[PDB]
Write a protein that holds these residues in place. Sequence first.
Motif, PDB file in Angstrom:
ATOM      1  N   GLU A  37      12.680   6.729  20.392  1.00 49.52           N
ATOM      2  CA  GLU A  37      13.069   6.320  19.051  1.00 49.52           C
ATOM      3  C   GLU A  37      13.422   4.840  19.048  1.00 49.52           C
ATOM      4  O   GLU A  37      14.219   4.382  19.873  1.00 49.52           O
ATOM      5  N   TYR A  38      12.835   4.103  18.113  1.00 48.77           N
ATOM      6  CA  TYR A  38      13.003   2.667  17.994  1.00 48.77           C
ATOM      7  C   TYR A  38      13.532   2.335  16.610  1.00 48.77           C
ATOM      8  O   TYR A  38      13.048   2.867  15.605  1.00 48.77           O
ATOM      9  N   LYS A  39      14.526   1.458  16.563  1.00 48.19           N
ATOM     10  CA  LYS A  39      14.964   0.843  15.322  1.00 48.19           C
ATOM     11  C   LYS A  39      14.191  -0.455  15.155  1.00 48.19           C
ATOM     12  O   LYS A  39      14.258  -1.337  16.021  1.00 48.19           O
ATOM     13  N   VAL A  40      13.437  -0.565  14.064  1.00 49.43           N
ATOM     14  CA  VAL A  40      12.615  -1.742  13.810  1.00 49.43           C
ATOM     15  C   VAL A  40      12.979  -2.290  12.441  1.00 49.43           C
ATOM     16  O   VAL A  40      12.909  -1.566  11.443  1.00 49.43           O
ATOM     17  N   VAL A  41      13.361  -3.562  12.392  1.00 46.74           N
ATOM     18  CA  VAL A  41      13.670  -4.245  11.145  1.00 46.74           C
ATOM     19  C   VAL A  41      12.736  -5.439  11.011  1.00 46.74           C
ATOM     20  O   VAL A  41      12.444  -6.132  11.992  1.00 46.74           O
ATOM     21  N   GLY A  42      12.244  -5.654   9.789  1.00 49.58           N
ATOM     22  CA  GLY A  42      11.273  -6.696   9.536  1.00 49.58           C
ATOM     23  C   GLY A  42      11.445  -7.284   8.151  1.00 49.58           C
ATOM     24  O   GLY A  42      12.187  -6.760   7.317  1.00 49.58           O
ATOM     25  N   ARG A  43      10.745  -8.393   7.917  1.00 48.47           N
ATOM     26  CA  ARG A  43      10.885  -9.086   6.642  1.00 48.47           C
ATOM     27  C   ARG A  43       9.673  -9.971   6.398  1.00 48.47           C
ATOM     28  O   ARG A  43       8.969 -10.357   7.329  1.00 48.47           O
ATOM     29  N   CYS A  44       9.457 -10.309   5.130  1.00 53.16           N
ATOM     30  CA  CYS A  44       8.443 -11.292   4.780  1.00 53.16           C
ATOM     31  C   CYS A  44       8.878 -12.682   5.220  1.00 53.16           C
ATOM     32  O   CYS A  44      10.069 -12.987   5.291  1.00 53.16           O
ATOM     33  N   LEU A  45       7.903 -13.537   5.504  1.00 49.66           N
ATOM     34  CA  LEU A  45       8.239 -14.924   5.784  1.00 49.66           C
ATOM     35  C   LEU A  45       8.847 -15.557   4.538  1.00 49.66           C
ATOM     36  O   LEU A  45       8.480 -15.191   3.415  1.00 49.66           O
ATOM     37  N   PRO A  46       9.790 -16.479   4.694  1.00 50.40           N
ATOM     38  CA  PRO A  46      10.301 -17.204   3.528  1.00 50.40           C
ATOM     39  C   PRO A  46       9.179 -17.946   2.822  1.00 50.40           C
ATOM     40  O   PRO A  46       8.289 -18.516   3.455  1.00 50.40           O
ATOM     41  N   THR A  47       9.228 -17.930   1.500  1.00 52.65           N
ATOM     42  CA  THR A  47       8.232 -18.546   0.640  1.00 52.65           C
ATOM     43  C   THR A  47       8.949 -19.400  -0.391  1.00 52.65           C
ATOM     44  O   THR A  47      10.155 -19.241  -0.606  1.00 52.65           O
TER      45      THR A  47
END
Lengths: 176, 159, 168
Positions: free
Chosen positions: A9-19
Amino acid sequence: MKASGTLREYKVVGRCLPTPKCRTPPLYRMRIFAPNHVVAKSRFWYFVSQLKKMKKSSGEIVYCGQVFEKSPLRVKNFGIWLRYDSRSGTHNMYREYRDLTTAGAVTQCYRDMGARHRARAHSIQIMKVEEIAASKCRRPAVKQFHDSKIKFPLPHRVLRRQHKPRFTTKRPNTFF
Amino acid sequence: TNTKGKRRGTRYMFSRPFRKHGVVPLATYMRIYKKGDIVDIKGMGTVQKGMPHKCYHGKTGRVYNVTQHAVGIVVNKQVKGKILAKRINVRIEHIKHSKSRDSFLKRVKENDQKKKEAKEKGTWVQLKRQPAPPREAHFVRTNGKEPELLEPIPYEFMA
Amino acid sequence: FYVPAEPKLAFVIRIRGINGVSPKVRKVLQLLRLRQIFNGTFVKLNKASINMLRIVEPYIAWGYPNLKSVNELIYKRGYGKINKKRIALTDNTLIARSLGKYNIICMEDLIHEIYTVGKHFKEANNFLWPFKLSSPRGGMKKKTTHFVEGGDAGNREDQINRLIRRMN
RNA sequence: GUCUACGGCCAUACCACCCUGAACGCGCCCGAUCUCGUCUGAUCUCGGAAGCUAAGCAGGGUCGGGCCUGGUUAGUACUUGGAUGGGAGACCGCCUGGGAAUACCGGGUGCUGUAGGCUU
RNA sequence: CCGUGGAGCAGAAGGGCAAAAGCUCGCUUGAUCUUGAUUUUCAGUACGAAUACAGACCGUGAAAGCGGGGCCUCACGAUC
RNA sequence: UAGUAGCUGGUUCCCUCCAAAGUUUCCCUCAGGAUAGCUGGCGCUCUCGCCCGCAGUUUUAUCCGGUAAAGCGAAUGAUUAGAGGUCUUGGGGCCGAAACGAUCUCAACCUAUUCUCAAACUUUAAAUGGGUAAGAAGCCCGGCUCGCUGGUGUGGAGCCGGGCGUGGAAUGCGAGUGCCUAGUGGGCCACUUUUGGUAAGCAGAACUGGCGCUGCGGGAUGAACCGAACGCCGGGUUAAGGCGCCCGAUGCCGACGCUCAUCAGACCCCAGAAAAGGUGUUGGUUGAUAUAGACAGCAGGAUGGUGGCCAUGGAAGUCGGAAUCCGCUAAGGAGUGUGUAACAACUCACCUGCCGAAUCAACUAGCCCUGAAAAUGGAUGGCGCUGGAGCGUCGGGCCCAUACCCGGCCGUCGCUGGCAGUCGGCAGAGCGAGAAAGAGAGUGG
RNA sequence: CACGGCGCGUCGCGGCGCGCGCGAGCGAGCGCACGGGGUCGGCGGCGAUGUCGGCUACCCACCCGACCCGUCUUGAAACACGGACCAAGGAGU
RNA sequence: CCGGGUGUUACAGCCCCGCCCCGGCAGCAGCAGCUCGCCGAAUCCCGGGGCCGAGGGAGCGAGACCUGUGUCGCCGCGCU
Ligand SMILES: [Mg+2]
Ligand SMILES: [Mg+2]
Ligand SMILES: [Mg+2]
Ligand SMILES: [Mg+2]
Ligand SMILES: [Mg+2]
Ligand SMILES: [Mg+2]
Ligand SMILES: [Mg+2]
Ligand SMILES: [Mg+2]
Ligand SMILES: [Mg+2]
Ligand SMILES: [Mg+2]
Ligand SMILES: [Mg+2]
Ligand SMILES: [Mg+2]
Ligand SMILES: [Mg+2]
Ligand SMILES: [Mg+2]
Ligand SMILES: [Mg+2]
Ligand SMILES: [Mg+2]
Ligand SMILES: [Mg+2]
Ligand SMILES: [Mg+2]
Ligand SMILES: [Mg+2]
Ligand SMILES: [Mg+2]
Ligand SMILES: [Mg+2]
Ligand SMILES: [Mg+2]
Ligand SMILES: [Mg+2]
Ligand SMILES: [Mg+2]
Ligand SMILES: [Mg+2]
Ligand SMILES: [Mg+2]
Ligand SMILES: [Mg+2]
Ligand SMILES: [Mg+2]
Ligand SMILES: [Mg+2]
Ligand SMILES: [Mg+2]
Ligand SMILES: [Mg+2]
């Protein structure tokens, strides 16, 4: 996904690049059951692309780490809400298992799906995994293990290591 | 087999855009083409004089001769396994200055200017356009709000 | 959270044969200098390299090499391309002549420049002959499919070190 | 603030109805000897200056139509490349990348060049 | 009065066209003489067709200009 | 007269190196030629041990398009259905001598909507893709010539001279050029796209790769499938595929399940099956009712108006047409079925007594089964296999190709590599060493 | 600690860095070796009418592999055609 | 001993929660030689099995006052 070995089990957090539109996009967190972090990240991108208008090229993995089992010595009941593809139509189901680890329960779920419905890992979409109290359990195959004075024998023990004494003058005993 | 007509299969290529029929705007006629400009070809069906053949539509060539109403341009055409640089005469309506060259010209002027400058300063400056480098390390600050869970939605039929 | 910088150096190993290759894939493999199965090379990363590798994903396994992997690859399989000839690097003077103008004068300079992607990484890598790696001891998982779906092709972030340990 | 002459981009400029226009100007308007042309001085051409913003024209208005530009639809449809994936097939799922269009919901309703005026 | 073409432009179809390429008048014969270049099929050869020019004689219009056939895509033929 | 033959048949030694085409155009051309294309040979002009170019590739810019999709409340062309208006007309009627005066209407019509479409429709509109540019042949200056164009040494072009090197995206690689020239001009197959056809191991196209021209490991077998392309050998390791025996490898104390077949099943191409069903078994979804005591099961009731109205010869509930009430009730339907011509009688819905905890459905998906019939005896490759040697998801280990790594040997190509320096009592034994160039010769302080 | 002389030391920032002279850029021997591809300065047996060596070649056995060539052809082992066997002649002059 | 029921620490235990120095103490991806990882400029040592050994004048120092030798170059060392 290829459900190789025992899952983690992996906790993965992500986001869009700033624009120029928005400086700080919100961070999105997900629980991924995967053999390793590479396929975990791939599955994260797949799920987040389905959910939000996000793509790996227009995003970034802010963090990705394995989450260890909190109580790996307590036998627990796990309820899994699941979404899978059949040969004709897709179905939602809920299945309970009994194991010490969430990853172990999810691996059991994958093997059981393959065994009972011929569904493959690329078809199963795992939705929710929760610790479920024995009173809230509702599948008899799990409920029948809920008693204080559990007691049963091992009736018909089949002889293993059949080949080490390949020629033996006994006929083996199956009652121990 | 097919027909060898000069305008076969051009009903959409030589047609006019939607709600853009009628008088040709005069700015097209009022542009100056000299010897050696890089120029684009786009056949316009409104005028039939000096219409380029359909195989040069969308091609970019170099002007080598300027005439009262038309322009001669050298353009490459791929014929089987070889490319021929052939020269054709196109009336001025079906032609348009290429903006792919002016960007390079402006870049030349600008980096020449920044090379002339800092020459006395002795500092170093980069001129070659490097490709997009990999993103460097940085910090992503959470503002006390934890990231929210994302889960797949249950299947349920629409149609 | 601290996102580490995107890796600047990658190692690429060709894992498919010569028979039946699309012309575009063949051209990209020629440009990357993978003309033989189980050949390997270093590539610095940017938009051009990313797209070039994406074109030939099914034919290569690539990842981000480790410092120990770079050391072992240079020392054991590292040959120099001197006078259009494949010369094994058994002395520092061979490196010093071919890369003296770039201030690379020994194995340590070559390894450091490759690993950190220096100003003359292009010259160093081009001087470096493509690595001929042995077949992967212990076997592959599945050559045809992608690494994510249980195969060997495509991008594996740091498992390329595990692969190198058995392929060299 | 605005108009005229000539324009550039050619609806953010068009269409329908309504309200307001100080000064100049543009107009409507008054006549047919001459120039000119008609069945008809209606149009065109010519000679003027009694009257008028009625109309054109300009500005503004419409939970206006249209047009232009965004959001949604939508990471949906479609699609480059891959598999000794599924399925009797029809077709579908996944991996690697790209990624639409209606309905529906918002915002806007000409910018500007040269020369010459009016607002003393 | 409304009317963006829903008509017409010789013919099949498609493209194009509104103070026009359509309709009606006026005047004319650029459907004329001549050397080259180029495009279309192409081998990058001919024929056919077409495109920009250039040199004379002209037509038309106040003029800018436009015109060496038909708005464009087809209507044609070596040696002896 | 050895007549001609675009047509059959044959066409004699070795090794080495390179290595195709069945496509374009023309031909009384279609079993053939000519011409491009593909091949080989012979060279030549330069190049590096600052820089030139080139590319079946990408990147950054910039244009090009009308397919996939989508749209019809947008044009064209098809197309279903109801709404609201009027006299704009027609059609059934009606009061009217008649009257758009009036009543319904059915229509055509208009306005908003609505269902479904297009290879020869389209406002929109991808992905893949097609051009062009990314500098020295470039920029910035000064000056001359012109019979062209000219308000104007105006515009344009060509000339000279001068100054600028951070060689101006990534990656890779020596390049250019000229003669002569054989064979070929029957093709076939595969993923994807695609036309004709009911379809075909059919006929016809586009892209790419193959076979032909090609052997090798695997698919038991095999022109094309999967892997991989080849000099003669030793060792090691793999690809695809496998590891009960044939038959190298699981003779693992392999993991979790599913499945019984009196036609089991058993691995891309591929060599055989569908709609419809199963109270076989295993999962899953949804909804019910059950200590105010269900589900069975065993027993008691299952009534009056009324044999309700229209009916048929006869219909009392049970052939037919609407409805379906009430008081008694713990409950009884103007009735669920069997029965007679009609009754009668039996039975059900519904409620009670005993029994005392879980029970009903309707779907959905796995394996198995029915559907399932051909001719010599018969083929998951065979034997055979059911705590699998079957099916699904998986883990270690192991086996081997002419592939990959290391080594030896043969040959070819490249370095257009090195050696005339065997310079010896007349001599002094080097030009491998990171840095363009003298183990230099001699003259003065 | 791949530190090691004396000086003139600014060749210098405050000493370290870092320059100019010091017969002027010459200390020598031995020895060991993970050091530009194996040597032993290590040995043991059996040899005259029954034994030693002889890849290949003669015959035989076994395991694996293995369809008959030439030809036209998209495709030949073909239920396509030529071929009983052997010698000599025989076709780009 | 078993079954059924009540219930909340009793003659067993379980889970969560403020602190007591995150309470303190080992120890720590543990030879409690398998409870779950990724590695090594943050990595070295020892040993076993198999195949092979291709190449064959590398020089040292001696100084025109000598003419020897065949263990030599690079690299790492030891002794005087
Ligand atoms: Mg292949
Ligand atoms: Mg092994
Ligand atoms: Mg493949
Ligand atoms: Mg008048
Ligand atoms: Mg007015
Ligand atoms: Mg008014
Ligand atoms: Mg509006
Ligand atoms: Mg203005
Ligand atoms: Mg005033
Ligand atoms: Mg006109
Ligand atoms: Mg003329
Ligand atoms: Mg005409
Ligand atoms: Mg003869
Ligand atoms: Mg013939
Ligand atoms: Mg023949
Ligand atoms: Mg088309
Ligand atoms: Mg379509
Ligand atoms: Mg065919
Ligand atoms: Mg070939
Ligand atoms: Mg082959
Ligand atoms: Mg088979
Ligand atoms: Mg071998
Ligand atoms: Mg086998
Ligand atoms: Mg070798
Ligand atoms: Mg055999
Ligand atoms: Mg034959
Ligand atoms: Mg052939
Ligand atoms: Mg026969
Ligand atoms: Mg024959
Ligand atoms: Mg015979
Ligand atoms: Mg003979």
